[PDB]
Design an enzyme around this catalytic site. Structure first.
Site, short mmCIF file in Angstrom:
data_model
loop_
_atom_site.label_atom_id
_atom_site.label_comp_id
_atom_site.label_asym_id
_atom_site.label_seq_id
_atom_site.Cartn_x
_atom_site.Cartn_y
_atom_site.Cartn_z
CG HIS A 62 -1.91 -1.49 1.50
ND1 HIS A 62 -2.35 -2.07 0.66
CD2 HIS A 62 -2.11 -2.16 2.94
CE1 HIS A 62 -3.15 -2.62 0.22
NE2 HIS A 62 -2.82 -3.64 1.84
CG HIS A 92 2.72 5.91 5.73
ND1 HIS A 92 2.33 6.05 7.35
CD2 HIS A 92 1.43 6.04 4.86
CE1 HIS A 92 0.66 5.79 7.30
NE2 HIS A 92 0.01 6.76 5.98
CG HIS A 94 -0.72 8.68 1.44
ND1 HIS A 94 -1.45 7.29 1.37
CD2 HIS A 94 -0.98 8.98 2.63
CE1 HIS A 94 -1.79 7.12 2.18
NE2 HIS A 94 -1.29 7.88 3.59
CD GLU A 104 -4.58 9.93 2.33
OE1 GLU A 104 -4.28 9.74 2.90
OE2 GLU A 104 -4.63 8.96 1.47
CG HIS A 117 0.14 10.39 6.12
ND1 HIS A 117 -1.07 10.14 6.03
CD2 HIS A 117 -0.34 11.97 6.35
CE1 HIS A 117 -2.09 10.79 5.68
NE2 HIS A 117 -1.29 11.68 5.63
CB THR A 196 -6.43 8.40 4.49
OG1 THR A 196 -4.85 8.03 4.79
CG2 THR A 196 -7.03 9.28 5.49
N1 667 Z 1 -3.60 7.53 6.23
S1 667 Z 1 -2.98 6.80 7.37
O1 667 Z 1 -1.81 6.79 8.77
O2 667 Z 1 -4.41 6.48 8.21
O3 667 Z 1 -2.75 5.47 7.46
C1 667 Z 1 -3.22 4.20 7.97
C2 667 Z 1 -4.35 3.74 8.21
C3 667 Z 1 -4.35 2.55 8.78
C4 667 Z 1 -3.57 1.70 9.62
C5 667 Z 1 -3.00 0.28 10.28
C6 667 Z 1 -2.66 0.01 11.03
C7 667 Z 1 -1.09 1.38 11.37
O4 667 Z 1 -0.49 0.68 11.32
O5 667 Z 1 -0.68 2.49 10.75
C8 667 Z 1 -2.08 2.60 9.74
C9 667 Z 1 -2.12 4.00 9.00
C10 667 Z 1 -2.76 -1.24 11.98
C11 667 Z 1 -3.59 -1.86 12.53
C12 667 Z 1 -5.14 -0.29 12.55
C13 667 Z 1 -5.45 -0.22 11.33
C14 667 Z 1 -4.63 -0.09 9.83
ZN ZN Z 2 -0.70 7.83 5.39
#
Ligand code: 667
Ligand code: ZN
Ligand code: ZN
Length: 258
Positions: A62, A92, A94, A104, A117, A196
Site C-alpha cells: 500500500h 509512511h 502517499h 491526501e 504521515h 485514510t
Molecule cells: N493515512 S493513515 O496514517 O490513516 O494510514 C494508515 C491506515 C491504517 C493503518 C493501520 C495500522 C497502522 O499501524 O498504520 C495505519 C496507517 C495497524 C492496525 C490498525 C488499522 C490499520
Molecule cells: Zn497515511
C-alpha cells in the site's frame, strides 16, 4: 475484492467492505483557508524525537513505512490539541503518478506532490491495538512535500527503496532520525478524522502542518519505482496511493496561527 487503489478495488469501492467509509468524520479533507478558524486556545506542538529508535522499512503493498520501537516513552508527541502522551509507531508517504498530485489533504483545493504521515497512539490506552478503538486513540502528523530543493534528511530513505521494490520486502533501518523530515515552523491545522485506508476507523486527531517540506524531483521520482505487487507477479507500479478528499460534514477545522 481485497481493497487497493485500482479502478476496481480503489477508494470508491471501499464502503462495500467498510461501511464507515461513508461516516461522519472521514479523512482526508480539503482545508478551506476562507473558513479555517484560528483558535487562540490551541497550544504549540511538542515533538520529542531525540530518542526515536527506527527498526526497519517495509513495502506492505500500500506504501512503504518505517517502523519504530514504541516500547519506551522514547519519541512522543504532545501538546497542541492533544491530551496526554502519544508514542510514535511508524511513518509512511502517499504520492502520485506525477508531481501535480499525490497528497491526501488539500489546501484550497491545491494538491501537493506527496504527503508524509507520522502515526502516534495515545499511551493512556496501553497499546496500539486498543487505541484504534477510541475516538482519541491516534494522532497523525501530516506534512506536505513540494518539489524544489532536496531534503537532506530524506536521502537515507530514498536510497534504500531499491532493496524493497516489491510487496513483502523488508530491510533493517536503524539509526534514522525523523527530525530531519520536519519543516521549520510547527504552525498547524487540526480536526477530528479517520485513518485514510481500510479499516478507516474514526480514531484520529489530525494535525496538518502549514509549512510543506521541499524535496527534489530526483527524490520523489524514486518513490514511483516501487510496486504494489509481490516479487514474481504482474507488475503494477505503486503510484497514486492516495484517497480523495471526503465530506467535511459538521466539522470545523481550527488553525493554531492567525
Ligand atoms: N493515512 S493513515 O496514517 O490513516 O494510514 C494508515 C491506515 C491504517 C493503518 C493501520 C495500522 C497502522 O499501524 O498504520 C495505519 C496507517 C495497524 C492496525 C490498525 C488499522 C490499520
Ligand atoms: Zn497515511
Ligand atoms: Zn475569504
Amino acid at each position: 475484492h481485497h481493497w487497493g487503489y485500482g479502478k476496481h478495488n480503489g477508494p470508491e469501492h471501499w464502503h462495500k467492505d467498510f461501511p464507515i467509509a461513508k461516516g461522519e468524520r472521514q479523512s482526508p479533507v480539503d482545508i478551506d483557508t476562507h473558513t479555517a478558524k484560528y483558535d487562540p486556545s490551541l497550544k504549540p506542538l511538542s515533538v520529542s524525537y531525540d530518542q526515536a529508535t527506527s527498526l526497519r522499512i517495509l513495502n506492505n503493498g500500500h506504501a512503504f513505512n518505517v517502523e519504530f520501537d514504541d516500547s519506551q516513552d522514547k519519541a512522543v508527541l504532545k501538546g497542541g490539541p492533544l491530551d496526554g502522551t502519544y508514542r510514535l509507531i511508524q511513518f509512511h508517504f502517499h504520492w502520485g503518478s506525477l508531481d501535480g498530485q499525490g497528497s491526501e489533504h488539500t489546501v484550497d483545493k491545491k494538491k501537493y506532490a506527496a504527503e508524509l504521515h507520522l502515526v502516534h497512539w495515545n499511551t493512556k490506552y496501553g497499546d496500539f491495538g486498543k487505541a484504534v478503538q477510541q475516538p482519541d486513540g491516534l494522532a497523525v502528523l501530516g506534512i506536505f512535500l513540494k518539489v524544489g530543493s532536496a531534503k537532506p534528511g530524506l536521502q537515507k530513505v530514498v536510497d534504500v527503496l531499491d532493496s524493497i521494490k516489491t510487496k513483502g520486502k523488508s530491510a533493517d533501518f536503524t539509526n534514522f532520525d525523523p527530525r530531519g523530515l520536519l519543516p521549520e515552523s510547527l504552525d498547524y491545522w487540526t480536526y477530528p478524522g479517520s485513518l485514510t485506508t481500510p479499516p478507516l476507523l474514526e480514531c484520529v486527531t489530525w494535525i496538518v502542518l502549514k509549512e510543506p517540506i521541499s524535496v527534489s524531483s530526483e527524490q520523489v521520482l524514486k518513490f514511483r519505482k516501487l510496486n504494489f505487487n509481490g516479487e514474481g507477479e504482474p507488475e503494477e507500479l505503486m503510484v497514486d496511493n492516495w484517497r480523495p478528499a471526503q465530506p467535511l460534514k459538521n466539522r470545523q477545522i481550527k488553525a493554531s496561527f492567525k
